[PDB]
Design an enzyme around this catalytic site. Sequence first.
Site, mmCIF file in Angstrom:
data_model
loop_
_atom_site.group_PDB
_atom_site.id
_atom_site.type_symbol
_atom_site.label_atom_id
_atom_site.label_comp_id
_atom_site.label_asym_id
_atom_site.label_seq_id
_atom_site.Cartn_x
_atom_site.Cartn_y
_atom_site.Cartn_z
ATOM 1 N N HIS A 76 0.811 -1.222 0.000
ATOM 2 C CA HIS A 76 0.000 0.000 0.000
ATOM 3 C C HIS A 76 0.842 1.269 0.000
ATOM 4 C CE1 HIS A 76 -3.201 -2.897 1.275
ATOM 5 N NE2 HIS A 76 -3.826 -2.189 0.352
ATOM 6 N N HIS A 80 1.206 1.439 -5.783
ATOM 7 C CA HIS A 80 -0.152 0.919 -5.827
ATOM 8 C C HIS A 80 -1.145 2.028 -6.211
ATOM 9 C CE1 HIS A 80 -3.886 -1.084 -4.789
ATOM 10 N NE2 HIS A 80 -4.142 -0.163 -3.881
ATOM 11 N N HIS A 116 -6.872 7.111 -2.737
ATOM 12 C CA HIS A 116 -7.743 6.122 -2.097
ATOM 13 C C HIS A 116 -7.077 5.281 -1.010
ATOM 14 C CE1 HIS A 116 -5.859 2.876 -4.388
ATOM 15 N NE2 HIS A 116 -6.508 2.050 -3.589
ATOM 16 N N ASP A 117 -5.741 5.236 -0.982
ATOM 17 C CA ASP A 117 -5.035 4.569 0.113
ATOM 18 C C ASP A 117 -3.985 5.449 0.804
ATOM 19 O OD1 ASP A 117 -6.220 2.017 0.307
ATOM 20 O OD2 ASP A 117 -4.936 1.233 -1.291
ATOM 21 N N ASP A 234 -8.755 -1.415 -8.062
ATOM 22 C CA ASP A 234 -8.109 -1.725 -6.784
ATOM 23 C C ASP A 234 -7.830 -3.222 -6.715
ATOM 24 O OD1 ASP A 234 -7.029 -0.932 -4.341
ATOM 25 O OD2 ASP A 234 -8.896 -1.179 -3.250
ATOM 26 N N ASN A 237 -4.842 -6.532 -9.846
ATOM 27 C CA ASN A 237 -3.518 -7.181 -9.927
ATOM 28 C C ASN A 237 -3.568 -8.502 -10.672
ATOM 29 O OD1 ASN A 237 -2.414 -6.220 -6.561
ATOM 30 N ND2 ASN A 237 -2.367 -5.060 -8.477
ATOM 31 N N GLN A 285 -3.662 -17.112 -3.582
ATOM 32 C CA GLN A 285 -3.953 -16.320 -4.768
ATOM 33 C C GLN A 285 -5.090 -16.959 -5.566
ATOM 34 O OE1 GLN A 285 -3.294 -13.253 -5.841
ATOM 35 N NE2 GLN A 285 -2.224 -13.120 -3.857
ATOM 36 N N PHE A 288 -8.326 -16.234 -3.791
ATOM 37 C CA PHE A 288 -8.566 -14.800 -3.976
ATOM 38 C C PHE A 288 -9.271 -14.583 -5.318
ATOM 39 C CE2 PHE A 288 -6.346 -10.628 -5.220
ATOM 40 C CZ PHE A 288 -7.346 -9.842 -4.669
HETATM 41 C C1 LIG Z 1 -1.884 -9.566 -5.230
HETATM 42 O O1 LIG Z 1 -2.633 -9.863 -4.136
HETATM 43 C C2 LIG Z 1 -3.642 -9.141 -3.680
HETATM 44 C C3 LIG Z 1 -4.017 -7.902 -4.075
HETATM 45 C C4 LIG Z 1 -5.081 -7.247 -3.544
HETATM 46 C C5 LIG Z 1 -5.785 -7.814 -2.558
HETATM 47 C C6 LIG Z 1 -6.970 -7.161 -2.056
HETATM 48 C C7 LIG Z 1 -8.091 -7.725 -1.397
HETATM 49 C C8 LIG Z 1 -8.964 -6.731 -1.241
HETATM 50 N N1 LIG Z 1 -8.398 -5.696 -1.813
HETATM 51 C C9 LIG Z 1 -9.120 -4.409 -1.850
HETATM 52 C C10 LIG Z 1 -8.668 -3.264 -0.930
HETATM 53 C C11 LIG Z 1 -9.022 -3.697 0.470
HETATM 54 O O2 LIG Z 1 -10.176 -3.490 0.851
HETATM 55 N N2 LIG Z 1 -8.074 -4.308 1.281
HETATM 56 C C12 LIG Z 1 -8.511 -4.725 2.627
HETATM 57 C C13 LIG Z 1 -7.689 -5.844 3.309
HETATM 58 C C14 LIG Z 1 -8.585 -7.021 3.686
HETATM 59 O O3 LIG Z 1 -6.555 -6.380 2.593
HETATM 60 C C15 LIG Z 1 -6.427 -6.071 1.198
HETATM 61 C C16 LIG Z 1 -5.063 -6.487 0.671
HETATM 62 C C17 LIG Z 1 -6.672 -4.592 0.938
HETATM 63 N N3 LIG Z 1 -7.262 -5.956 -2.310
HETATM 64 C C18 LIG Z 1 -5.425 -9.105 -2.153
HETATM 65 C C19 LIG Z 1 -4.324 -9.786 -2.700
HETATM 66 O O4 LIG Z 1 -4.131 -11.011 -2.175
HETATM 67 C C20 LIG Z 1 -4.847 -11.628 -1.132
HETATM 68 C C21 LIG Z 1 -4.389 -11.203 0.243
HETATM 69 C C22 LIG Z 1 -3.568 -12.323 0.672
HETATM 70 C C23 LIG Z 1 -3.353 -13.128 -0.546
HETATM 71 C C24 LIG Z 1 -4.649 -13.017 -1.266
HETATM 72 MG MG LIG Z 2 -7.678 0.659 0.656
HETATM 73 ZN ZN LIG Z 3 -6.022 0.107 -2.727
#
Ligand SMILES: COc1ccc(-c2ccn(CCC(=O)N3C[C@@H](C)O[C@H](C)C3)n2)cc1OC1CCCC1
Ligand SMILES: [Mg+2]
Ligand SMILES: [Zn+2]
EC number: 3.1.4.53
Lengths: 327, 324
Positions: A76, A80, A116-117, A234, A237, A285, A288
């Site tokens: 973050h 990003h 936003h972050d 957001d 990725n 992943q 996710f």
């Molecule tokens: C390349 O990997 C990712 C990229 C992005 C995210 C992800 C999920 C939600 N967002 C949206 C913004 C948000 O709301 N958050 C709130 C918090 C829960 O953690 C997120 C990180 C940020 N972004 C997740 C990713 O991976 C997962 C986390 C562990 C592995 C699987």
């Molecule tokens: Mg955020």
């Molecule tokens: Zn973000």
Amino acid sequence: KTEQEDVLAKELEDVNKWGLHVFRIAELSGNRPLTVIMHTIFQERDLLKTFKIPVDTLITYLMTLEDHYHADVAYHNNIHAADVVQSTHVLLSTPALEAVFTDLEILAAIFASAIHDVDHPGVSNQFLINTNSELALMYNDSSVLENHHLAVGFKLLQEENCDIFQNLTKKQRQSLRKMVIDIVLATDMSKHMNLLADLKTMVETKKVTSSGVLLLDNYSDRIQVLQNMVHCADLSNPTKPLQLYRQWTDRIMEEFFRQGDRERERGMEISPMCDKHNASVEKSQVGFIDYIVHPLWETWADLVHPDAQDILDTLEDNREWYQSTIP
Amino acid sequence: DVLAKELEDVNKWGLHVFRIAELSGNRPLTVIMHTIFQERDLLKTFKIPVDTLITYLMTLEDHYHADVAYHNNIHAADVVQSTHVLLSTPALEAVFTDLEILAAIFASAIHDVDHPGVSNQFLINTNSELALMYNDSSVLENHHLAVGFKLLQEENCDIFQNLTKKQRQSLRKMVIDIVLATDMSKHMNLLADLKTMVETKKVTSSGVLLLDNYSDRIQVLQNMVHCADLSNPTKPLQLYRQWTDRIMEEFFRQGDRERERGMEISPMCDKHNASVEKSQVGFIDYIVHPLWETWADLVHPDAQDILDTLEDNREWYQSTIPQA
Ligand SMILES: COc1ccc(-c2ccn(CCC(=O)N3C[C@@H](C)O[C@H](C)C3)n2)cc1OC1CCCC1
Ligand SMILES: [Mg+2]
Ligand SMILES: [Zn+2]
Ligand SMILES: COc1ccc(-c2ccn(CCC(=O)N3C[C@@H](C)O[C@H](C)C3)n2)cc1OC1CCCC1
Ligand SMILES: [Mg+2]
Ligand SMILES: [Mg+2]
Ligand SMILES: [Mg+2]
Ligand SMILES: [Zn+2]
């Protein structure tokens, strides 16, 4: 719009493309990817002229905004923010949305993406709540970071020569402010299920002109599409060229594991996917993608069909990469 | 003394809270909270040290503003005491846990703390730091919560120190849900759902409301504290008149600032053109009666006397207004 010793212009030729190499841009710009990309988008969309934004004012704000993304936070950070800006910029240009949004709405979505972050501490809302942080106290445990990001993003406008909106009318400022708040609060993951549901409803009631361009009738429609658009950016990725995605995955695991280390150190239950001692990065992943990213993007692809087909195809190719690398 | 005599009425609607303010050295919030915590045996139930409770209350009361005509410590004490009465309504007997009771009462005590005497809209329209911090959403109500909880951190102020971790978390959640429901922008939605709650309500043989899930339970506490916040016109006229004086002084002061700033003066905030009678009738007609009527439905016939006073007070304020 920053000292670079290089160029950088060759890479910036992909600013209108999905899979712009934003990490390269960061390196080539002296770690000013957010200022560089934002400055390029504002010039390209002619936003300075439209809103009479002095260029030195724009660069002063951007540099200050960029300075308030933490350099020691792995995911973050300013890259990003630059990534979500640039991705939103591309989504806005999608054929199915041609001339749908006003210049102010375009400006709102881009500004929102950029802030936003901001001042993200590298831990989750829940970590901040669980540890009784001053931030969670300030915001009553509700969208703690997203509220903060907005407050900071707007507060920085008040620094010297930083008010890029000084020449908006009072009404324009009010509308832009409302839209940016609506967009950034929608990046709270706790709203994801609700947002997607409403996106699916939008797809079901989709209206298109002859050319297949979406028809949005009012603020609710337009803001909803903007909210989901920036939420898609957001969460973009895994839809990027694999080499980008692989690095994004490395960065979020680094940031997550650091949170887990803080939790472990304080005798707290370690959060899901934050335990470096017991992690399954590849499996995580895939989950996710299966449970969050594909559902969303499949629905977005539906809304703008077939504008997002290659993104959906890459998402599927990337899912397979991580699948094939589970030990 | 005389104060102890006035506090004999602490379980009755229409407590003379202004008298208690005078007699307690302007500490109505402190003495009424203390009295109610003793009454409901809250100190024992939650192992709250009395020196802690009093220390927290005095600090809380200090954080209501003396120079704010309506949104001050007397209003806080009044909402606390009204909530306290409503909680003991027969239709709700043994419905709520002591923790939920603690949450409603604590919510009422902090629900307007550090109020600056101007509206959310004023703060949004003048680009205040508060509206900036809270992104124009429930600006003051978020602030009240933050300050109210923050004061718990002061020396010997943590009245929840002996709550279990789960208890504290649950209480914090409930208090937040309650104080945010005091945001007028949520009134119509709150009222709309209350009406639907009333339409489908379930009661035991003994006639008590059955509220099975958290959503229903907090919904009732939200509207209960909202009714207590909106309870002035349901009070004896001598009390209601004083509340009306105060809110108009507060509103006219906001209007003065708006005028000085060249802003459009907000509804009912112009000392030169406003009518108290017309304003209070509209207030009862479009806000207070529609809500209290629904509450009375929920707990029928428990609130009928409160509703009667309201209708009398309405009939009274409208009597000096010429009508066809
Ligand atoms: C390349 O990997 C990712 C990229 C992005 C995210 C992800 C999920 C939600 N967002 C949206 C913004 C948000 O709301 N958050 C709130 C918090 C829960 O953690 C997120 C990180 C940020 N972004 C997740 C990713 O991976 C997962 C986390 C562990 C592995 C699987
Ligand atoms: Mg955020
Ligand atoms: Zn973000
Ligand atoms: C004795 O009179 C009143 C007592 C209470 C209120 C009143 C309205 C809403 N509440 C609920 C708390 C709240 O949300 N606010 C938000 C803000 C709009 O103004 C109110 C001040 C407080 N309380 C109004 C009263 O009348 C007004 C004066 C002109 C007629 C209306
Ligand atoms: Mg190229
Ligand atoms: Mg529509
Ligand atoms: Mg209030
Ligand atoms: Zn109040």
